[PDB]
Structure formats: C-alpha cells, structure tokens
C-alpha cells in the first residue's frame, strides 16, 4: 500500500539531508548529515537532548514534545533478508519519491574508508547525495515500521545502504 | 476522500506563509506573504517570471519547469456556494492539518482596511497567522481542483477567507 501523508510528514529537512520523527520526541537521521558546530537542533539546546550515535545511525530524544501531532511508531534494527522496503525520499523542490528496495544483509561494511553498520538493498524497477537520512520503511499488517536511514549508494544507485541501530544478533557479525 | 501525498507535495513554504504548485510552472500564493525586496523566487530572477497579482491573489508563471514531477491540475475562481473544501495546511513543524470548510459567497470584502476579492467559508467540526497561502481544494469526480489560497480568518478562526482569482461573473459584484 502507499505511504500515507502523515508518514511522509515525519520526513523532515535536517542538516545536509533529512531525518524522521519516530514519535513526538524521537528523531532519527544519518550521522554524516548532522550539522556540525551548532548549539541547538530544532530550537532545543543540545543539553536538553539525549543524543545517541552509533556509526552512521543517529537518534535524538528531545525533552519536550516536538511533534505532539504524531503517534509513536516502531523502529527496528533493519529487517529480514528479502523484505521489500520503501525509501521515503523528499527532494528540496518538494517532490516525493518513494523508492522500492529489496533488502539484503545487515553487516558492518567499509564505505569510503569508514566502517558502517547498516543494511544493503537492491533498488527495484534512484537516490542522490542530498537524500541521506531518508527513512527505510515497510508495512507490517496495518502499520508502518521504520528500520533504517539512507546512508550510501553505489555510483549507479542500484545498491543502497541504510544505517541501522547498533545491536548484534544471530541474523546479522 | 483524503488528499493524497502528491497533492500535499504541491504545498510549499514561501515567504511568510505558503504557496501551491498548480503545475510544473505555475505557483499560486497569497499576495501579503510574498517576500518584499527580493530579486528572485526559487532561484529564478524576477524578469524570467510572469507575475500576476490581483488583490490578495498572486500567480507566478516560471519560464522553466520547476516541478516537472507534477501534472497540471485545475485552478478555478472559487467554487459554488455550499461546496465543502479542504484547506491543506502545512505547519513549520511538518504537521499536516487538512481543515474542512463549507464555502459561502465570493465577494470583494473589506479586511483590515483593504478591499479583498475572495470567498468566505465556515470551518466545520483552526488556522493560524503563518498559514496564509495554503490552498483551498475540493474533489470533483476523481480529481482535485484548487480554487483559492488562505488569506484571512476571524479571530476565533470560525470564518475563513481564501483569496481567489480576479473575474466577474453572475454567481458572485
Ligand atoms: Na498514495
Ligand atoms: Na489519507
């Protein structure tokens, strides 16, 4: 089914890319797009935010409700092999570009000199440099689950990588 | 039916409010939110734009395709008495707030000292100052039609006014 407007409304311009409101207080994004040298995010001073970063995954937990209009939704560490996700890409022009991607292995992979814990995927039937931070989502029953943020792609764009939360598990090491 | 994501994607932050891409080259907004003193809009120099303004209605026609992802859609001068429209409000936070409004008479009305050609409406079951420029749309058959841009509201917000294109006609003088 198609991503509803409210889901798109979670995708938010941030730094040199985008991020995603998981709930009224939780924002996720790709580490390398986070602005450098600032003293606040969304008008909130850094000391009022719990900032967790693991490789290319960044999560902010704000101490006040930033998007009280939203329900919380489920964030998971990647998804099973073969899961078809949608990358909810917003462009600066306002265009929405949902990209279908069949996900592969969760691994720590070397990307441009750095080790990155993420999940690779194959673009179906692409992304650009400004798209980093866009969420990878998939529908489970009647709800949407977010499981990664856009972090990298092969020059062609045919293979993509989403950063995912830290955590070891027997399906991924 | 609910406004689809693509329709929302036409609503665009602009000046002190918003505007709406009617087509890849046509952008409409409320005159008073248009930035003052600038030499370009969306990176295009003023001399490359056909700028039409009538009271509180402003239309830009750009000489290049600014949103080539979009189809053209129908813009009309207001709508019939009693038509239920939706005001597609975006908030700075990213929240989407579609507001239902039953439209009334098209008239030139005095608003804060100025004569404004527009259509008033009643909010059903509200707006804020930063919402000006948001489109008033309604569904006709399988398509959406845009017919005004948010221009004013009573302090409570219960009555709203959308600016509409210039034009006289026997249903409106
Ligand atoms: Na849809
Ligand atoms: Na909907």
UniProtKB/Swiss-Prot annotation, chains A, B:
**Which reaction(s) are listed as its catalytic activity?**
Endopeptidase with a preference for cleavage when the P1 position is occupied by Glu-|-Xaa and the P1' position is occupied by Gly-|-Yaa
The residues responsible for catalysis, as annotated, are 32, 56, 132
Every Peptidase C37 domain range: 3-173
Q: How is its activity regulated?
A: Inhibited by the chemical compound K36/GC376, which covalently binds to the nucleophilic cysteine residue. Inhibited by various macrocyclic inhibitors.
Q: How does it assemble?
A: Homodimer. Monomer; in solution.
Q: Give the protein's biological function.
A: Processes the polyprotein. 3CLpro-RdRp is first released by autocleavage, then all other proteins are cleaved. May cleave host polyadenylate-binding protein thereby inhibiting cellular translation.
Q: What is this protein called?
A: 3C-like protease
Species name: Norovirus (strain Human/NoV/United States/Norwalk/1968/GI) (Hu/NV/NV/1968/US)
Q: What is the lineage of its organism?
A: Viruses, Riboviria, Orthornavirae, Pisuviricota, Pisoniviricetes
Full-protein residues shown here are: 1101 to 1281 of 1789
